[PDB]
Every structure is written in structure tokens, then in C-alpha cells.
Amino acid sequence: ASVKVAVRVRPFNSREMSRDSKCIIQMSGSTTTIVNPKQPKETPKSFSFDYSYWSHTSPEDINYASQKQVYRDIGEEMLQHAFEGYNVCIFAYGQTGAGKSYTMMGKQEKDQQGIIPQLCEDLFSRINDTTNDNMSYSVEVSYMEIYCERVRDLLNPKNKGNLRVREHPLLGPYVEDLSKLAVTSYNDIQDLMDSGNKARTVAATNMNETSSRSHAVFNIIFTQKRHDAETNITTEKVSKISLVDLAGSERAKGTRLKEGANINKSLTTLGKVISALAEMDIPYRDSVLTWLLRENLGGNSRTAMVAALSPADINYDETLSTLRYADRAK
Numbered sequence: 001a002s003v004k005v006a007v008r009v010r011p012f013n014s015r016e017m018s019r020d021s022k023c024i025i026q027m028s029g030s031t032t033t034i035v036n037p038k039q040p041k042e043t044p045k046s047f048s049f050d051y052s053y054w055s056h057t058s059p060e061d062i063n064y065a066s067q068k069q070v071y072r073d074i075g076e077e078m079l080q081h082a083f084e085g086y087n088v089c090i091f092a093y094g095q096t097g098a099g100k101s102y103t104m105m106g107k108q109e110k111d112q113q114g115i116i117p118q119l120c121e122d123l124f125s126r127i128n129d130t131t132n133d134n135m136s137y138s139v140e141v142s143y144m145e146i147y148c149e150r151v152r153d154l155l156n157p158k159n160k161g162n163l164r165v166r167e168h169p170l171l172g173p174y175v176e177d178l179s180k181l182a183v184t185s186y187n188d189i190q191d192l193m194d195s196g197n198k199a200r201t202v203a204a205t206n207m208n209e210t211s212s213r214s215h216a217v218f219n220i221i222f223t224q225k226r227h228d229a230e231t232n233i234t235t236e237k238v239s240k241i242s243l244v245d246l247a248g249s250e251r252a253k254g255t256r257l258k259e260g261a262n263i264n265k266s267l268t269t270l271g272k273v274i275s276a277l278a279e280m281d282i283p284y285r286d287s288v289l290t291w292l293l294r295e296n297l298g299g300n301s302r303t304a305m306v307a308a309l310s311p312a313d314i315n316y317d318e319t320l321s322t323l324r325y326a327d328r329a330k
């Protein structure tokens with residue numbers, strides 16, 4: 001499938017605990033139902049997806065969708081599509097606090113690593129364990145934040161200023177002066193991640209709360225160089241992997257007119273793009289995010305989205321909204 005959609009519900013968080021929230025979400029197979037706390041005597045609205053991940057409890061539970069499970073269904077198949085020579089995208093969509101960052105980057109400890117570190121680890125593992133003198137590889141990475149139409153390099157502490165996305169008259173859009181680093185090992189790319197994740201939550205980021213108002217894009221340029229001993233020449237196969245942690249879907253009160261405008265525009269545009277992609281079996285320039293990722297959202301590409309869901313009753317409206325958004329992706 002060129003477009004896969006999964007939803008994932010998390011355990012209660014602190015706000016919900018202090019609120020004595022009821023769980024209004026239940027799952028069965030590929031189906032997720034949601035109860036309207038103000039109307040308990042109804043039958044819940046139902047939704048069906050490629051995957052409905054029940055992670056509302058914990059790894060101690062036999063039925064708990066772990067980071068490992070999610071990655072092996074969605075992430076693993078994407079990496080394989082990249083080895084086959086084509087571009088891929090994985091988006092985490094949802095309300096602030098619903099579980100987007102946890103699903104994508106997760107935690108630094110044992111057992112809690114998200115899609116990004118698991119995919120990177122898997123990649124280098126397949127590379128180093130590739131036995132063949134004719135096959136060599138190169139892995140380059142970029143990590144940035146898209147906030148109010150401007151780009152922030154997370155791999156360069158003194159990213160002096162806000163870099164613009166530009167459209168090369170022939171080779172496509174790109175971020176000017178954005179750092180792209182060649183990495184030769186996992187611990188090395190892992191170093192970059194930690195370093196970038198660190199930059200997303202420093203104290204200064206609380207001024208404009210960019211951790212929840214900007215889109216975080218982790219890009220990997222995967223190049224496979226194929227040698228051939230007969231008539232001695234290499235053929236390069238380049239795959240682009242974009243792993244995205246979108247801005248909170250609820251900010252699309254207290255939200256500034258322009259932050260909200262851009263975020264709405266971004267999420268709305270991404271939705272049209274994906275629905276179109278799923279249609280095929282497209283206004284890219286309408287937002288910086290969809291503009292920068294156009295090549296990873298083409299007819300050749302493959303995309304998957306994981307929509308994070310809060311379990312509690314207090315977030316019924318935003319959670320329904322997220323489910324509808326995922327349902328439209330198709």
C-alpha cells in the first residue's frame with residue numbers, strides 16, 4: 001500500500017489522572033471505537049484502519065502494542081521500500097500530549113525507543129551485515145524544525161538564523177545552508193539524534209513552545225552503490241527517508257494567529273496530499289512542510305501515518321477530530 005494509516009492510544013497522562021478521566025477508547029482488530037462521555041448510552045462511533053494500536057496499559061500487559069510491534073509493522077516495511085530504491089515518509093499526527101514524540105523518537109532507555117532509532121539501528125545492521133564487495137553505502141542525515149514557515153537546524157547549535165526552503169529550478173526544494181551529515185555507524189547517528197532531540201527541548205524553546213508548535217523532520221539520504229566486476233562500474237540508487245513529528249493538531253486557545261494559520265495550513269495540506277496519494281491507488285507549495293517533502297510524497301513514494309490518541313473523556317473533541325483526520329487519509 002502506498003498509504004498506510006495507524007492509530008495508537010496511550011496510557012492516561014498526568015492531566016487525565018488529576019481529572020479522574022474515564023477511558024473512552026476501545027480497540028478490536030483494526031477497529032477503534034470512541035465513546036462520547038456526554039452520551040454513554042450510545043453505541044460508540046467506529047473507525048477502521050490498517051492498524052489500531054492499543055498501548056493504553058503497559059508492556060506488562062499481554063496485549064499492549066509496544067514500540068517494537070509498531071516499528072515492525074510500519075517502520076520495518078518502510079525501510080525495505082528504501083532498500084528497493086524509493087522514497088518513504090512516516091508521520092506522527094495528533095493532539096499535543098497524545099503520543100507523537102514517544103512513537104517517533106520514544107525514550108532513551110531500554111525498550112522505549114521509537115520508530116526513528118529502531119529504523120536507524122535496523123538500517124546500519126542490514127548494511128554492516130551485507131556481505132558483498134560490490135555493495136557499499138552512504139548514509140547522510142539532517143534534523144530540523146519547521147516553525148512559522150522557517151527552518152531550524154537541530155544538528156547545528158548555533159544555527160545562525162532561519163534558513164529558507166528554496167526550489168532549485170531543476171533538482172527540487174531544499175533548505176539553504178542546512179547541515180547534512182555523513183554517518184558511518186549507528187552509535188554515531190544515535191549521537192546526532194540525542195543531540196537533536198536535546199535541542200528540541202532546551203529552556204529557550206519554551207518561549208514559543210516549539211516542541212509542540214513546529215514540525216520536526218528527520219531526513220536520511222540513503223545511497224546504495226552497486227559495483228559490477230564484468231564491466232567495471234557502479235550504479236547509484238538513492239532513497240530519501242523522512243520521519244516526521246508534526247505540530248500538535250489542536251493548534252491548527254492561546255495560539256498566535258500566524259502560528260495557528262501555518263499549522264492549520266500545513267496539516268490541512270498534508271491531509272489533501274495523502275488522500276490524493278491514496279486515491280491514485282496536488283497542492284504541494286501550499287505549505288512549507290508539504291513543499292519540502294514533495295519528492296517523498298510522489299506517486300512512487302510510500303507514506304504511513306501514525307495518529308496518536310489520548311484515551312480520556314476530556315479530549316473527546318480533539319481525539320474524534322484526529323480519528324476523522326486519519327480516516328480521511330484513507
Ligand SMILES: Nc1ncnc2c1ncn2[C@@H]1O[C@H](COP(=O)(O)OP(=O)(O)O)[C@@H](O)[C@H]1O
Binds near residue numbers: 101
Ligand atoms: N504508548 C505509550 N507508552 C508509554 N508512555 C507513553 C505512550 N505514549 C505516550 N506516552 C507518554 O505520554 C506523554 C505524551 O507524548 P509526547 O510526550 O509523545 O507528546 P506528543 O504527542 O505531544 O508529542 C509523554 O510523557 C510519554 O512518555
Ligand SMILES: [Mg+2]
Binds near residue numbers: 212
Ligand atoms: Mg512531542
